[PDB]
Ligand binder design. Structure first.
Ligand code: ADN
Ligand code: ADN
Ligand code: ADN
Ligand code: ADN
Ligand code: ADN
Ligand code: ADN
Lengths: 233, 233, 233, 233, 233, 233
């Protein structure tokens, strides 16, 4: 496809979608066997391998609705991908949500215009595939993770002049901010395929708490495992 | 409160919210014991009774975001209600959704402006309380119902000059149209309480299929049972 | 129709539209002769009777644009109703508007999206039928009522986190808040029929002044009389 | 003021507001005595004179919301003007509205953003002053004119790539298109003063019928007379 | 055309577009030879003459997007005009922009809805014709003027209840406020013709600094010269 | 900064901003001397080197407004970057714009909501820094490139269900589609720094014409040279 140089059939029907292509590489190296790298266009690494005997892929998406939308469109339309699980990070809005929690997004709010353009006059609420959601939730619960299922904000702007609205969203139960889910969920719905976002809380927007990769790496691995565990079902 | 003449403490912390006050009466009469009617302001009947030993209420909401918003605000703010389960009907958008299916709304799309006014520039995705959702889903699954968990449209207009957008939403996986969930979910989130909408598909918008109360009454009863079963947990 | 169980011809061409179905019952019992109740679907009572020799109906609408829109659409499209006069209550915004004043809405502002969806990019100003307006105004003037003809706000939300905009509207001459007129006026215009809203100021939003039915019942009756007097012309 | 070079007190409290400054000149010359021209800034002629013994002014506004808004703001804020009657032309949308009809605008729809900016999330319906409206209506009725009281469209664009929405508005009873009323009515309301627009139908948008000044001059004069007759009351 | 009484061929292909028709007259009298006045409809004077041997016209536009849109549409569509240079005034937003500076608008921001209506969901950035822009810039530079090339605000409202947004725009580099450029640039682009706005800073919005015609007349003349110098190329 | 691991001072004040980090690497390797790679967070390579004796950096941005906004914010706020030149690709909308043309964006249209959120009610037109624009234009002209200065569309969605609006924008002179400029220009303006986008037309949206890196590599190099030539001034 335009942004993915894979040959037909090289991408598995189940795919994990980290924002960071280097995390795709990490996931492939850490969890998968019989790995090949099928894409390095724009450095947006994608890999296919085998996990517990099942083929799976992992494809970076970049950050933001427009970037992930490119990849998701191509994966679905050009590569026949059926199950797409974003494995990402997010920033907690509320004190009640803690760093290293895993958030499974039921739905996402957004400041993107993408859905307003598609559905003028409507608020489109992008919805996770419940099957996948339940699988991931059950896997996370069994794995002993702190799993929160709820609402997230898919933001176009990481750096907002005022966080007032973000705070307000937090007061309405929105758990965390991230930059992809609206697009993933909307496009998956458009094409009748199955999507989920499983997120690790990496930072707390208002408390300032931040983490490096390694500082959330055990939790991150466990999260990847549940995203993979859900995927291979 | 302005629209509910109940004394403090007369409304249980768990409440079912049919749109039709006559369905509130039906639910109270059919399922509850030790029933009292605490409201007949505007004919919007509300009852409190006991179900399998647990106090529960049932309160009509009327149709539409503005009507249910009145009642939900009052129930939450004036009567301390904590668990609110709309038990309603809806119109299927897709052929894949069948009359008498039970839909548990994860989230809701809307053509209402209510959330645009609250969150200018954002698409707010109103989210069910996952705990309640899971309880209802599990109860429905155990009850042997066809339960679909997914997205719905909360419509301001029942009678639309064109159903093109509704169809488009259906193509994006939106299961059914109804007229309350956005408000319920948004307000419950605002106030940190727990909401869910459990819906019986009563009609199919495009196929023209329609049902009367009795024609979906067995399924309706089973749905009420799961809404009550979820509530009493 | 879907929400009205009347047989064809049971609903008169002129109809009063209180929000409260119990007020429909009151109006029928108090003012009409040869009354029959043609609807009790959803408790949304509707009656037809005779007033000073002329057949007239009275139909509750429920609260909010979506609710009244259902009934008005059905009345117009399915029952051939030609003259629709909402007889309602409203909350004064300004000190200059007093409890028990009668407001005849020339037009209505709204926070509803209903007209934005119909007329993207436009502000649609829903307009009363001037003939009816003048009749009601003249009748009210002759009846010795305080009648104010002006602008109202048709609100989707009764319970607003901030009344700043409502206050601002008041500063622009908007007299009172209510929850139906935009829809009535817009739909009547759509279908080329005649609508008016005649409102009793029942409360003052900022002063906190409130009234019960009986506390405005003499004025309310006189208002009903002018709505009927206008209707039978 | 910035756009009006009149000294304080030179502008009467009642003013007619044609869009065309040359029509202001015509009105002053034709109807007024003891006339002085108080403004020729930007050629936007303004005059004050006496009509049937009462001082009155006439001030061109130019075309469009932004132009009239300038003048109306200045007239109200800087010159203490209290009664403002636009005397304009308009283009009929419907066949039912005929060239040379006089339209008294109750309210106005618009494609302007002016009110969306002032009242985010709301549709503001600009309303005529009913007193003035009634006076003009009664005067027009007594004068034997075809007077239509209703809704108009205040357009920002005279030349629209598609008239579909304009047609749709016509189907919702909007009588005619013009380019000032929203602003006049909104600003008058803002400042607690009295406004009305009295319009002569000069063209029919869809039929192509057009008129020159002289071809509607007798009707135009009669309209000016009612705007003056209303003003001097 | 509807608003211009010129015969075909009387308007030159290059035209200057002051907002003030009296400035059109000034420009024609001061700079042009062999002048005729081709329009006095609505007092909106238009002239054609010769400048340094080249035919050029000058046409008032009135103030605001709707007014200039009328004239520009007619000039382009009915009179075959190809190069349109607004020669106007503007109010500085920033201290960094000084009275008597000449601003050449690259683009314009707006609070008008005109482009939202044309391009729903999009922000249309109206762009100057670069050729013309460069010509004017080079001419202004050679003339020894302070020329600023940048962004302007095309405002619908001259009199804003709050200048907060205007200030904010100034913080984003918007140089000055005026009331026409969006329309000129958008329409010129629509029709594939060439437009530019060259503005004299006549006032400073926040400092209160104001100028009369004569107080900026030397600079104004030089600006007209560059608009003419650009035009005749 | 959060997404750039550079130490303070490692990033030059002038920076080129390709969307593709691999193009950053190409630019650094091909044009710069004394190169160091200061960032590989998320694979979003950034380099600093020397070009014709002047320090310059090159930093990938990723695709889309949200991605570039992250990097631009960080570059400006955390690294004191002053001159930012996006060097990108774009898709021609019109036949009149040819593959391998270089487009210098004066401004950008967008379907992003980013500016609507910042400037509610306004259309913000993001503007290039004219100085930089002129430098790049002059350099491109001297280099013998086909340089087009004009308007572009900054799209959030690469894959649009309908290109109707894109076509319409093309009819209004918008030259090409890309996915970053609005953000770059807006943020640069916000922070008072200098931005430009210089684009190579790599594809034609409607004709289907596409190019690989090498197929536009000579032109691409020349474009990079002008972006560098402009930068080092
Ligand atoms: N606080 C945050 N705000 C926005 N996005 C975040 C945040 N924390 C993590 N992310 C995620 O990481 C990237 C932004 O750093 C995006 O892909 C986004 O999903
Ligand atoms: N087809 C439908 N469209 C909208 N609302 C529906 C539909 N079917 C059932 N409903 C529900 O019933 C009422 C409208 O008849 C509302 O309360 C709504 O939730
Ligand atoms: N203050 C108020 N705000 C909104 N609606 C009101 C108010 N007072 C009376 N109403 C009317 O009564 C109902 C809400 O109580 C609605 O039908 C509405 O029209
Ligand atoms: N068909 C029309 N469309 C828009 N404005 C019109 C029309 N006919 C008359 N007008 C009025 O005349 C001017 C435009 O020609 C405006 O002031 C407007 O109010
Ligand atoms: N401060 C200002 N605000 C708006 N428009 C201005 C300003 N200064 C000059 N103008 C220009 O002059 C007219 C408004 O006085 C408009 O045509 C506009 O372009
Ligand atoms: N046809 C196109 N549509 C959108 N973006 C494009 C196109 N061609 C090139 N681009 C650019 O390349 C990336 C998308 O492939 C974005 O960074 C964008 O700026």
């Amino acid at each position: 496809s335009v942004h993915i140089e894979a040959k037909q059939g090289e991408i598995a029907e189940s795919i994990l979608l980290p924002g960071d292509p280097l995390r795709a590489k990490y996931i492939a190296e850490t969890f998968l066997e019989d790995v090949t790298c099928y894409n390095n266009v724009r450095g947006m690494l994608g890999f296919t391998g085998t996990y517990k005997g099942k083929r799976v892929s992992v494809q970076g998406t970049g950050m933001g609705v427009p970037s992930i939308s490119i990849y998701v469109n191509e994966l679905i339309q050009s590569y026949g991908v059926k199950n797409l699980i974003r494995v990402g990070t997010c920033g907690a809005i509320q004190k009640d949500v803690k760093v290293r929690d895993v958030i499974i997004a039921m739905t996402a709010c957004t400041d993107s215009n993408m859905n307003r353009l598609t559905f003028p006059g409507f608020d489109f609420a992008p919805a996770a595939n419940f099957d996948l959601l339940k699988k991931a939730y059950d896997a996370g619960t069994e794995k002993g993770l702190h799993v929160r299922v709820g609402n997230v904000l898919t933001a176009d702007v990481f750096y907002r002049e005022s966080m007032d609205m973000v705070k307000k969203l937090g007061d309405y139960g929105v758990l965390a901010v991230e930059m992809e889910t609206t697009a993933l969920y909307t496009l998956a719905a458009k094409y009748g395929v199955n999507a989920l976002s499983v997120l690790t809380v990496s930072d707390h927007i208002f408390t300032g708490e931040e983490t490096t990769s390694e500082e959330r790496q055990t939790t991150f691995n466990e999260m990847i495992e549940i995203a993979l565990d859900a995927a291979i079902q």
